[PDB]
Design a protein around this ligand. Sequence first.
Ligand SMILES: [Mg+2]
Ligand SMILES: [Zn+2]
Ligand SMILES: [Zn+2]
Ligand SMILES: [Zn+2]
Lengths: 151, 98, 233, 95, 238, 581, 109, 44, 205, 227
Amino acid sequence: YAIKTNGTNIFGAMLDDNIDPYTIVSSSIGDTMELYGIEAARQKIISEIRTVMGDKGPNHRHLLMYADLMTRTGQVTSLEKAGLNAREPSNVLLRMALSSPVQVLTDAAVDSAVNPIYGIAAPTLMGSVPRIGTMYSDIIMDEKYITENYK
Amino acid sequence: LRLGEMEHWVLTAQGAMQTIIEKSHDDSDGCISYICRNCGEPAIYNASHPIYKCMNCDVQADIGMVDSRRSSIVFQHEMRAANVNITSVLSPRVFQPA
Amino acid sequence: MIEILEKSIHVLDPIFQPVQHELNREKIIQFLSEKVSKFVSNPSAYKSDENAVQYLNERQLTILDKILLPHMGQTADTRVRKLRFLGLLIHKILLVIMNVFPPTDRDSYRTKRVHGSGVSLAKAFKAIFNTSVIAPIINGFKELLKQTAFEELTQRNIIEAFSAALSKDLNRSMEQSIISGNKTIVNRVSTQSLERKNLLNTISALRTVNTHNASKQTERADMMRRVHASYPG
Amino acid sequence: MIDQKIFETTLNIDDPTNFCTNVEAHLLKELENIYVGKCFKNSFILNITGVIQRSPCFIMRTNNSGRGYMHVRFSAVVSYSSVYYIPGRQQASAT
Amino acid sequence: YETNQGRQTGGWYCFSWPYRVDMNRFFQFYNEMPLVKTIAHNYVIPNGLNTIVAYMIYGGYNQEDSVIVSQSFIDRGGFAGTFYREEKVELESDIESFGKPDPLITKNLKPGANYEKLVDGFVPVGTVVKKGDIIIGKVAKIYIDRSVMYGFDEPAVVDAVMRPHGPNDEIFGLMRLRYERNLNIGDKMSSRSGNKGIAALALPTSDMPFTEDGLQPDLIVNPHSHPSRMTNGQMIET
Amino acid sequence: MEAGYAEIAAVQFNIAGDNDHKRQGVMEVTISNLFEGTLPAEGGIYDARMGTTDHHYKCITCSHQRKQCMGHPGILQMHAPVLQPLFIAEIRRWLRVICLNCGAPIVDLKRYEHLIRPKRLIEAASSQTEGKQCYVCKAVHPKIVKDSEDYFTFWADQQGKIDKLYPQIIREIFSRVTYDTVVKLGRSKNSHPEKLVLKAIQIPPISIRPGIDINNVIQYLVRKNLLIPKDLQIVRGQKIPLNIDRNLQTIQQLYYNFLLDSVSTTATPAPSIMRRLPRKEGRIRKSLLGSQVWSISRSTICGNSDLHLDEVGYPISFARTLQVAETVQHYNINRLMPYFLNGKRQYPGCSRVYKQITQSVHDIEGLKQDFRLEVGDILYRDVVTGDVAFFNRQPSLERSSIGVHRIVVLENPKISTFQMNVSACAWYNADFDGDQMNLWVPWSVMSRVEAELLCSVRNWFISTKSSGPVNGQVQDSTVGSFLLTRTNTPMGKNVMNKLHAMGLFQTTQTDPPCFANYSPTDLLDGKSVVSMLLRQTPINYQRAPTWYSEVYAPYMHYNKQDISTQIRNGELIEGVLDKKA
Amino acid sequence: YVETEEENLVFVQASSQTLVIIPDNERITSNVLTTFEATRLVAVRAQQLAINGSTMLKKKYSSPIDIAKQELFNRKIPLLVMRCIKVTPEGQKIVEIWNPREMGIPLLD
Amino acid sequence: ENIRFNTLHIHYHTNEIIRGEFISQPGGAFENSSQIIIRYMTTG
Amino acid sequence: MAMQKLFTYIYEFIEYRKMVLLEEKVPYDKFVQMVLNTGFFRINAETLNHGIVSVFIFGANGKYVHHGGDMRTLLTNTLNEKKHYEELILIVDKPVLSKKNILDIIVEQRAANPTIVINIYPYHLFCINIPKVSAIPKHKLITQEEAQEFLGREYLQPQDLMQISASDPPVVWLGGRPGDFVQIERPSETAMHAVVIRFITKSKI
Amino acid sequence: CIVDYYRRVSIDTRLVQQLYGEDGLDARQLETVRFETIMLSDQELEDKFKYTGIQSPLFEEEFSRLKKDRDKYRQIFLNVENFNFSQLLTDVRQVPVNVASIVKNILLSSTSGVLPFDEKSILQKYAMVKTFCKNLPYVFINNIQERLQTPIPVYLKRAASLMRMLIRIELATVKTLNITCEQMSAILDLIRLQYTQSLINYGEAVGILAAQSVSEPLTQYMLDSHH
Ligand SMILES: [Mg+2]
Ligand SMILES: [Zn+2]
Ligand SMILES: [Zn+2]
Ligand SMILES: [Zn+2]
């Protein structure tokens, strides 16, 4: 048997001597992060997303992708525009494409942001195709094979 | 008939491209965009009427061609019309050792 | 009731502070007439003239007699009963705040009406008639009095000014109110094109009741689309 | 005064399979079509000389033309109102 | 779903349809009072037919609420009718005029369009119009061309002799196009219980399954369409 | 001259100052007339140097036609300066940190020296600076306030008279500041406040403003610029007459409405420039991220049990409308000749040829005398059975929402639907209640290779989401497999003679098995024929079927030979086949 | 349009890079073509045949997609795969150049 | 679909608290109605 | 309460830090009464390098958590002790981390003496044997040359790695500094545990 | 988020994952197999997997490796069960290659029935299984480095731990007794080939895949909100 409560306080339960302090499991991601570290926050994110998906939920590597992206900076960053600023501040074009193009355009202009072209939205907004799967690897013509075993 | 945001997302998820190049560029608003590569601003090039110049740094022009879309050029023009200077770094040339 | 009402009475106000503690009815009436009436841009020149003050006070009292709770009456002798009904309304509101009452069911049909053709067309027509008839007529009369002396003019001049002022619109405005039905042009003409897919579609078009609101992300959007228990029948 | 100048340029190859058979000679041919007799980068390029460095024949990414570009670093002899080598022209002018 | 589909259902859309010029209106020739009617049919005309429906599996062409339709039931007139469209164009001013443009001074002739079969600037009634045919020809600067091209891939027939006098006291074209609409493969059908289904099979009368006493269905609907939707009203109606 | 291939590695954004506009614009606009004859008025806001929107002329600047011309900016020399509408908040922050009379900062730079650079200016603006003293030049700093009746105008009250901060003396004040103050405040060297105010604004190229609606705003702006005298030299306290003041205010408000109309940010009748970006139907999400494409078809989908899962039924009319680009070479001229000679008249025909010698496309209606193709020619030919086509259904939520099917052209003209196997619906989450699906046939060689090698629907048989299979038997085929594989029918044993066993394999399109060992009266079991099908791909499977459920078990007598399904190397000898299997 | 404002916080020619090539004994990327790389190689060769037409296959094929696919399968593709993830600020590009005639081929079936 | 006139509609402000709106129509269907809104505020 | 668990687990934390105690451990009663008495409590430990690391446990209603000058005096005289002073540790109540004045004093003192590191932590970082918590994987610091060879194999710059805050519980228990690399053995449901290396970034305050 | 040439997932150049799925496997190339040792007891483990036909401490080392793998799996997934609400320990894992199927195929394609005892062949089979398991982490690298025997990065050693477990479970000498040395080499080649085929591709846009795969169940979460 064990206790499932409403509301979260890892600190107090950890302080209480009639309950096990090493097996605190809290639904909240913020509390888990703040008293356990970014890795436990990542694990809690995976667990919560898995619970939300349910039985039909996707392969575990997708939940791993979610958690590893949202916790790659040492703090739980959201998927909202604020998380995009936290993770990718130099990608002006991606943030313009997401939401509020005017504000981020003005901020980039005043900040003189140098935006490198990477990912999907940044090259798409510049009229170029992203460097992903079929174009991830450069293909160079074989000089010696053509000179020797061709022509 | 529209190949919307989610269709582009799906084609990306398949690592397609090429098909993305076809459908978007070669089939909607494909255009060639010339950039000086010495100043990062759009330039002027014409093969028939042999124009090879850019207004920003005239003599120092080293134009290269960048495949783009008319929508992207119009978007850049709109950003410049809002007094935001969109200058492009362009990929550096890569040479092998002698 | 007494506690909340006393607290509300003693609380200061940003705007009506000068008349907050005024026991003089005339001074408060004049204050409100200054605040709400147009065409009073410098509320100190007219102050010296007692007739201007009389005009403002009488105009304000007539306006309030017409405007505040008109269903109880629109004359001076009904002011006490209007205040009785206003007190009853405040009593009901503060009863609801007690949880003695629940809030009004926004989707129940105990407090809803359906206004079709006649009511909607009249409510759009008063505004359209005003804008397209009374405004041009007033403008034409003002221009005519600019062109001639106020005593010199003759009856035929008045009639010709009347008829010419309306040259220019009413039909186009009514037709646009019908065709558009667009909720902000706020238009109260719920209108739809008559698509004759069949006889059933036409008769169901003529038997349609449209909410025609806005409703953002809330439980309201779900709740107002459900089958309410007052719908049966 | 004539002088030796080093230039940077990215070519464009319309048929990389044909071109890569004889890369060096084909490169010099393309360069003498492109740069001989035209003002470019504050210089006139009288005569083409050997290429200092070149690049593998990369296939263009952003287009489906199957064409290649290659980068070339070549030295060429140039004839270097101070002076106006307006690019794309076959004569200078500093009148 | 039935409340929606019965209002979408094609039938006698207007009792005075010939006098009207309505855009995108379909007039289903044959209508039947249901063998199982309701009180609603005292007040509105029924729209549909009492098709013989076999709730059976036939080759799997009726999976995922598709319907197998007898080609003979289509040919005989089932769910057929006329589909109407209207093309109206008014002159911008007295500068324009209806009429077949002259090839020389037109200066703006349509590329490869027909421009024949026009009389006085209008295609006469009973004329079959293809995707390249020019209708309601209209030139301006009287030159320049502002003529109207048919556009639609599906050929139509013209039946409208009218050049009305508009509210601005000016003439306009207002021609009406008539389309021959049988029940093609891909047209949607639905029973009064709300079971939509796209018609995908054209089986001749010999290929249709038949009972011991010669009865064959018009539509073959998949039995799988029932249990999830619980449309038992359709089965009781049958 | 060579314009070599290149790719944009990075993009930098900057404030566009007077010099940037001056060196960027191709010409100068000083005339209010829009059109002067058929040709646009020279020197106006429609001058051809900016760009062409009509096929009647060329850009002059680039000598390209309307298609290949990308537009070029212009310069309108304003007779009075204007504030840049985007950076009014930046202007407010700058005015309240530097001395109005000398330009040196009035805040202590040492307090914000250590701080992170982008926020230094915001903390500097947060200081009151009211009545503060400027040490370097001994001048009291006034209070900078923002007018509430508009967005652009600035005032200044120094414990007293409120003088208006016109763009001219604002330019003077910003010019007083030096680079060191800007750098130490965390702003880039390119972020100097002198760039915030402009005397020569940039008129956008005609490519972004076609017309023969924002051009109206630009035209009124030019006219009002003409209505302003050229010699305006406003100083702090010039008390310019009300007519010049109202005209300058109108010119500034008109520029602000040209740029930022109906757009409100945390800062601050033709829709302005910035209104065109956001929202779904704006510039970004409708033009860049999405696109309208040629060579694409849409129609209602419907079932067809005769098509393989990797095949889609394509009506012949669509195949005649859509085209596939096949270049004519030595290896394919023999195969591509029938497509050419069929032409517009017969299927499979073709109507387009791109002659490399002429570098132009030709309609085959006039190619009777040429009568032949050549190496280096591109022939656009009708889609044929076996071509690969992309098959999509909105909403496209999964990786499998866009798959490549093989084209099966249905030559019957009465059919206009897209036909696809019912088992293929699981990819697109589609049904045949009226769904419409997109289909475009790749025409480029790279696109075809990529489609058939990477986007083929076989790659999406195993779900990327849950790593399981998505396709299978649905409804009809599930119940059919159950009926076929069960042990007993109501008539007794579930057997069929040799004729009906062969009838089962009639329409599988495979190589039919050998029934030569069966007498005409031999009775084949259902598990027997299922095994003769499964032996081609022998697998091992042992699982209870969905037909067997404990909840049913008390009622109805399950056949013990049906409640356990067992397959050994493709030999189905037990149970039934149903949803589980 | 009001931007719902949470207002969140945060020499134009790049120096040329020298293409440094990792020696074949220090290449760590997989010696088997990814399906992306194989698809790209087949597409590039097929387009090159579409524009040039020359071939090295002893068997006649009527379609460039087939010639390119069979060239990949028979390990005579005249194209090298340059795998590159590095660009140093020092102006140097670190790539691995793989010969597909030596790499294993993915399924593609 | 319109709310009833001459009827007090009290729904919570979900700086304000409970609010009541009374739209008063003086006479028949066509008389113009003056709406009076009573608010109970967080200030008391 | 937080104080008794803090008292046991802080010596546990010093034990994990592989550091020898200098001051003798007083009993719980003396410690708790002294916390109210003197407003704090000082614990001294020596590293393997043989440098002094000090720890300060502050009561919630103590003297030095209320205002600034007292806090300034305490740290100024403590850092004036003739010790090697490789690290100094503050432990304060959780809201006290939001009293910007005290952090201003600690920041300005850090500026005054930059050659040693000053850190401030809440109680929960020391109210349990954090490394033994189930949800926390096994953090461990790798040496500079091992991390450098790892990066050189991967052609990675140190900033390209995932970042871990120096205020994380297990990194503090490790004693990790900014510019150090931590290797984490994290359990996995797809590969049955996997190893990552993270880059330690300056602590959040 | 794009998989780079090290099969890390990185934004531009900043890492997001040291290895894509923590195993580097495509989600479309997985199968749920059973790990037969997890639920066994020590006596049962000895009965089923410990080999007694040949006297050698080598096979004792093999069994001790198997037991250590079982103890490991138990410890990690018990902790995983601990810090979750209701995610329990299961012995069914998604692995790229089902070794049991390959063994069954080779046994059903065998040229004979039960083989006669061959001690040298048994020792060769165990030694080659051990060598293959030790060289397995080179699938994430290449065969060049496998031949050069360059050190494996630690995360790559950890990536193949589950598959090393599975191979040691399925190719245990108790189950390999009827498999010849040539058959075992064929099995090893097939395992390596399928493992190579199951790896994620350089340049796959895995962020889009994760976004789609998580956003799809959100629709059903909406639909099941009313429940
Ligand atoms: Mg549907
Ligand atoms: Zn330039
Ligand atoms: Zn141009
Ligand atoms: Zn000063």
